[PDB]
Amino acid sequence: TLYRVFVGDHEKGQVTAFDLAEPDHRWTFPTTGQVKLYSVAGGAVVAAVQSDADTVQFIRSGISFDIEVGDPAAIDASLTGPRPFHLVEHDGKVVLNYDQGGYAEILDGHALAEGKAEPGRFPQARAHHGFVAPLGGNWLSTVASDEKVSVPRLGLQAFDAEGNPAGNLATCTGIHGEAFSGAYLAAGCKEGVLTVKAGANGSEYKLLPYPADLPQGVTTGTLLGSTGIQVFLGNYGPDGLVVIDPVDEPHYRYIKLPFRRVDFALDPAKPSTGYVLTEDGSLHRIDLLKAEIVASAKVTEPYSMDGHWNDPRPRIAMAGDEIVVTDPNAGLVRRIATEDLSERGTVPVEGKPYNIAVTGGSGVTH
Amino acid sequence: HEDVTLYRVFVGDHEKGQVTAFDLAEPDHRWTFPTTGQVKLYSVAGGAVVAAVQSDADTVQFIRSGISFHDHGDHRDIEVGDPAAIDASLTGPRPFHLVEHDGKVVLNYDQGGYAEILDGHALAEGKAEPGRFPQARAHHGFVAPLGGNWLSTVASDESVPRLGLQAFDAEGNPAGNLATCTGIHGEAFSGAYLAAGCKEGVLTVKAGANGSEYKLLPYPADLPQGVTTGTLLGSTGIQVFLGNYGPDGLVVIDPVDEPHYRYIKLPFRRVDFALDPAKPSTGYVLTEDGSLHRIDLLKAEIVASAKVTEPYSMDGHWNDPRPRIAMAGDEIVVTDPNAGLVRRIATEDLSERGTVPVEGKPYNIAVTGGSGVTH
Amino acid sequence: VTLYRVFVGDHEKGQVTAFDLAEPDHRWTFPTTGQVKLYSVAGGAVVAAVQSDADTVQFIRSGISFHDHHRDIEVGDPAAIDASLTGPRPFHLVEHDGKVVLNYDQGGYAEILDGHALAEGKAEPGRFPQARAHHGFVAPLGGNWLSTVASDEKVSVPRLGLQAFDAEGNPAGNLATCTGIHGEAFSGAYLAAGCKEGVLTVKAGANGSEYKLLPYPADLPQGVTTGTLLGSTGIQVFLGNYGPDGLVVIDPVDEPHYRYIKLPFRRVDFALDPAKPSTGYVLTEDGSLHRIDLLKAEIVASAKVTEPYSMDGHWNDPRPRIAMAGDEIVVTDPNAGLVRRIATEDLSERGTVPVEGKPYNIAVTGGSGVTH
Amino acid sequence: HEDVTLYRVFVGDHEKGQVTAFDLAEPDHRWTFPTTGQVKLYSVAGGAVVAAVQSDADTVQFIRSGISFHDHGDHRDIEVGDPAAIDASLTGPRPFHLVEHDGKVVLNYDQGGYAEILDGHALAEGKAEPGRFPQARAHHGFVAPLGGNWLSTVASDEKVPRLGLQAFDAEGNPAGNLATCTGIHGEAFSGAYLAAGCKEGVLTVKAGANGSEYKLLPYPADLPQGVTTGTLLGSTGIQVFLGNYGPDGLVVIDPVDEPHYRYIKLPFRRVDFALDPAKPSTGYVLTEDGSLHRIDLLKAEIVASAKVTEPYSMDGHWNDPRPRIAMAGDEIVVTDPNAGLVRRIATEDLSERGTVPVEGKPYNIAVTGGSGVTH
Ligand SMILES: [Zn+2]
Ligand SMILES: [Zn+2]
Ligand SMILES: [Zn+2]
Ligand SMILES: [Zn+2]
Ligand SMILES: [Zn+2]
Ligand SMILES: [Zn+2]
Ligand SMILES: [Zn+2]
Ligand SMILES: [Zn+2]
């Protein structure tokens, strides 16, 4: 097996890649600005969205799945536009929201994997901080209000390729955050969590309103979907999580955090578990079956969640039986064992390592 | 539709039986309430009620804020009217420490051997008739609601020495064994925990399935010797306590994991402190040189300081006229008794945004209000 | 029980008089090789009597000891320690981190004693080597030994500054400039020392000694320096002289680092009040004692306690010396043959203690504790 | 007929009484001048003279530039020779702020209770003969020529608060009423206006037929509270001032039209700033992280940034060794005390075009010269 870690800097436009098992096998790729990294097209491509720099660039991992392995390589075709931000990949498509452009860009995943980045433009009625998700042959876009001044958002709506409605608007006030699991897309709302099921008889919309038992005045705005069981992990305020079952009641099981959340991830190698890093520097194992934190260990120094959302703070990603955690002030990436959260080693990375993504896995060569 | 923010500050005098209230952002909107004697002030019932404990004068009076928040509600409604006295007192021998939790306000009568229980919601609707909680003996203690029980301090048989803490029923019948906490003093809630200061360390109790779960956190041998934690604050945002440790120290207390204590050495002796609920990884401590310091609770260190008053030496009596601080959103309000004013300090950078004149020697302070929605 | 025991040296004879403050007829006399400068050491269990002119350092057991099990006090008669140190011109004494360190001005080394061993009656020193003999000091800090360092001028020895060493004199970092370095004290996290350029501060750091010079502000009187420092034990602040007729309250952390106090006459002696750490006391050459508010950096009360003792002439002429004993200041009065007791509360004279000779240097041991 | 450009930079040491001069484009053409103490440098008399005010050393000395320009109908001719000390010096108790206007150079003696008035032309021909302007009381102030009057700051009596600004004749006889400007500090000219910083806002004055015309620009309520403008630059292009507003803010101040204020939040605290006379509305500000930022004065925003020095925290005393900046045509020159150099930064793109080594810890800076004609 081969995991290749891709680490961004907090300030410089730079992506560092290294083989997890031999960090001396390393590469550097230049970018226009600060990167937020996404493993896409099955891990054959890393997308480096640079919101502040109106740019999106791509890097070949280049691990393709049998597994074929070569050195990573930049894709020179890039993308430019006004504040690309949220990236959604589903049904073989990568979709990029341009927050200050009022449109999204649709890329074919296979085409990216062969080094081509020629997008089709999806029009939106108004520019805003949104996303566009492929589902059931439609493009499900967030929809802003026409009310003037940060743009208020009304909900989610299915559209065709030309940006004409393919279904009615589903109310989801302030819609934010999205994930897929099983047959379901989920998105965070002021009223609860909106689910859409790609079903045999078409798309099924159902809002799951927040139960009265949940803390008041706070919402789910960030979602992860398990790849193994049909369940979502969402935040619920800065100091809580909800395990969300989209099918049966009760839809929500709340988990109280003792410090505020810095980042989290679900373990694709152990689909009934995830990890959450909190501002005291502790990484916690989440048992999705029990809906509780079941183990913790301090892995970084504290990083207060007070201040600005994009300040330098640790980011996490999964790589096999390890969690990789960037530590910007320490200039390094820490490797934590999923088995018992022991520290297996560190990897020096120059500068302030910030965002992170992982590609690869286990395969056959013959 | 407007988000409305409105903080109303309540200031007691060091000598006069007087509470001054004013709108923080509009200090000419102000009111004065007479009291029997020197007040110690507490915001209770979500800020709908200010309790004015007057220990030396054996009474507690209440003032309606009257800023109240109500859940419509996909959100929070704010209702604003003039403050107004509640005519109904509580009366007794030297009430002192006040505890609010699980919707109850509880007052300890140091010279009476009982505490009085008031319902928070009933106070906010203007009623102050308490239910009595009997104690085996009079002492300087407290009674805290927890897990359906009443956790009271307990005196010895011999200032009255105190043995520890114990869970009781409403009639004062024991609901569990005494938890040793010698000289028990100071208390606060954070996350799942009640904490109280002891001679041996800090006692924690959490509501458990078989009742309250007690655990003593012993003071490490590293800590300066001969001094203890006797005053505690609990964060409402994260699960952590801040206590003093001697006159010139603080401890950040983690109730869960080791290390339970992280010591912060203050450069001058402590006058007052407060935690910032709007920025829960931070607090503020005022020291006797007149400096206000921002506390990083996560790293347990002082991270910024500025001189905000003239010095107020900690030599002399604990109740001499000295500043008191309270939080009001993105400001700390600091009373300055000798100057006749309350100072407004920005939490962002510790700059002084302005001052508010208050007659006399403004002493104790409490804050009501916040942010909400109208219609 | 509270018990303060005063130790008074003579200006000429090698003699220390000890007496219980509350009953001065409970007294003892100890001979010494020569004129003493007295230091309360090992928490008050031991008095060190440095005799610079006589190449000797002798010790006297207090003997008041506190067994911080609140705190227990044990009281017995004071007693000489028979083991003494001898060497060329011992002078400045520093106590910190359980170590008492003596600088031999004409020996080019210092002697390190363990405070605990002294309190149990043993005086076996270790030798700290220096590059060159000079009037300096050696201070423990963060596992290192911060020694003053002389120049190679020829040949009073000019001094370059302060430098960290290990116990054998191997350098642990570069020398920090502090020209004519003189005076030292600890308060809070800081060591401070006086320089021509200002006051050098040093903190124990993760990677070793962390130096920071505070240069004298231009608003301060010119041509004069801080050469004598006291450090508070209850707050983090230093009191230094600044010239013969000024004081500076020194904040090692924030600006302003210096706050000047003009004295009405030149300074004879000063001390900080450990029982009231925001206050100190300064005696001026007119014979007045002044209370210093360290927080406000000002004199807040004055009273005449002795006849004048001009600061003209030699620095070691017979002059009053002061020390704290609970709620009193004790003031030697060499010409009157007395120790005067001054109440800190209101600076009135609570009494006198007649002593043989010309009482000069003074130190206080004891305090308050519990008995059973 | 030849267009010649030649800038001559003058740099003071932070410690030594020393001014270094060098031709910007050929730094090996350089000169050194001794002074009594630490200098603050001012280009005066069209750049023919550098004034070296030494506040701590109770001295002011002058250096002939000596690059001078001479009007020539269509254009200016440039005259170039070596610089040279002016032998006449001035002494007095703490000379500090210097104002030049209407051909007069005026120096405020902070601890003397007067200012000295010098004629620019006499200075340019090498004479330092001051005229006396008396003040009611010594203070940290300034005296500005305007409309035939002398506008002096005015202190209180007491025993120092400053009350405002007042117009006088040359004898110190009041020519108008006191204009309130509490704590008045900082001044600049732009167009018809003198401006000065106040606790209440920014005071502006224009020369009118009935004497000085005052109008205070009160700080808008939207601005951060409790902080002030105390340092002002006057634009030669649009008619606007650039002031600080707190340690980490700027305001573009329009004395004629609303909005009178446009606020700029700096990412770190301000070290120094300057306006670019080659452009109608561009300035430069150096912040404590070592970044130089280009300010668009009409949009009131930072439009470009680059790191130019190591960090120099604004913690500590204002007069500690820190970079200072000045304009030289299409470059900014930045002193770098720790690096021992002056850095040349291109205004077009903020790149480092070169450095010039200077002895010691280069601190304050002034620039003389420019573009002119030779025949
Ligand atoms: Zn195969
Ligand atoms: Zn977002
Ligand atoms: Zn509502
Ligand atoms: Zn109490
Ligand atoms: Zn005992
Ligand atoms: Zn000496
Ligand atoms: Zn010409
Ligand atoms: Zn000034």
Author numbering:
A (entry chain C): 32 to 96, 104 to 187, 192 to 408
B (entry chain A): 28 to 185, 192 to 408
C (entry chain B): 31 to 99, 102 to 187, 192 to 408
D (entry chain D): 28 to 186, 193 to 408
Reproduce passages from the article.
We have recently identified a periplasmic protein AztD in Paracoccus denitrificans, which is able to transfer zinc to the cluster A-I SBP AztC23. Here, we describe crystal structures of AztD homologs from P. denitrificans (PdAztD) and Citrobacter koseri (CkAztD), a pathogen of the carbapenem-resistant Enterobacteriacea group. In each case, the protein adopts a beta-propeller fold composed of continuous antiparallel beta sheets forming 8, 3-, and 4-stranded blades and containing a disulfide bond between highly conserved Cys214 and Cys231 (P. denitrificans numbering). Two high-affinity zinc-binding sites are identified, only one of which is competent for transfer to AztC.
Site 1 is present in the central pore of the protein and zinc is coordinated by His124, His167, His218, and a solvent molecule. Site 2 is contained on an extension from the body of the protein composed of the N- and C-terminal beta strands and a beta hairpin from blade 2. Zinc is coordinated by His99, His102, Asp104, and the side chain of the C-terminal His408. Zinc ligands at both sites are highly conserved in ≥95% of AztD homologues with the exception of His408, which is only conserved in 68.1% of analyzed sequences. All zinc occupancies refined to > 0.7 in PdAztD and 0.4 in CkAztD. The mutagenesis data clearly demonstrates that zinc is transferred exclusively from AztD site 2 to AztC, leaving one to question the function of the highly conserved site 1.
